[PDB]
Nucleic acid binder design. Structure first.
Lengths: 125, 125
DNA sequence: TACTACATATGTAGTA
DNA sequence: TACTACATATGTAGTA
């Protein structure tokens, strides 16, 4: 038995990379994340170490280098995070959140329609 | 000039109450929040104090009691939080998040249709 | 790669 | 109501 599966806000950047590349080396994660923000190799490795310790990822040695892989279902931890978020910011109501989106004009009719599409597509049995 | 407007995860419970009741007393916030979880008067007041200090709320004295009110646009801070969330968990793609919802079966066709509705309703000019 | 360091934050709550 | 206390966490990063 265990508890709360945790992913600090800054940790998602590491996990999204681990989930996206299935099996990766710290160095890899490090270069990938730098491709879009100023972060030190050490900092990222701390995140890596921390995830590894919370057991959200596992590893094995390949050459003499460590390669990491997810030890948690992505769809599940993101979904749990999202409900938390939705409850706190909208009393868990996708409507209330999709409506706050249109309102603040964070969506152009092109995206509004693509959505309405896919979404109409889901209702379709 | 100033910076980052902050609302710790536990703070939203206080703000949602301040935004919902327009002008409130700490005591009020305290009873309201207890109506759904075990939290001490002091704890909640700390949140209140902290928000007040970050200037996300202001106050005036009424009888000799303090009444607080929002000093920030709700639609704006929630929206900023949501983009942050969406970028981190879905590379900012409402589709990708609405699809993760249906998938994990966090939505019954009733809600799926209400959504598709309102949403189809938004595309409607 | 493994530990350690560390200012700031966070969730809880106690003293003045 | 105002401060203080405090374990744990968090984002950054340095030493072994």
């Amino acid at each position: 038995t265990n508890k709360q599966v945790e992913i600090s806000m800054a940790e998602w950047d590491v996990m999204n990379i681990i989930w996206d590349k299935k099996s990766v080396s710290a160095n890899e994660i490090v270069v990938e994340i730098q491709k879009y923000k100023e972060v030190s190799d050490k900092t990222i490795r701390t995140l890596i170490t921390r995830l590894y310790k919370k057991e959200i990822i596992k590893r094995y040695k390949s050459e003499n280098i460590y390669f990491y892989s997810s030890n948690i279902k992505e769809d599940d931890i993101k979904m749990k995070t999202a409900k938390t978020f939705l409850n706190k910011l909208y009393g868990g109501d996708m409507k209330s959140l999709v409506l706050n989106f249109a309102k603040n004009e964070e969506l152009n009719n092109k995206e509004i329609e693509e959505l309405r599409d896919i979404l109409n597509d889901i209702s379709k049995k």
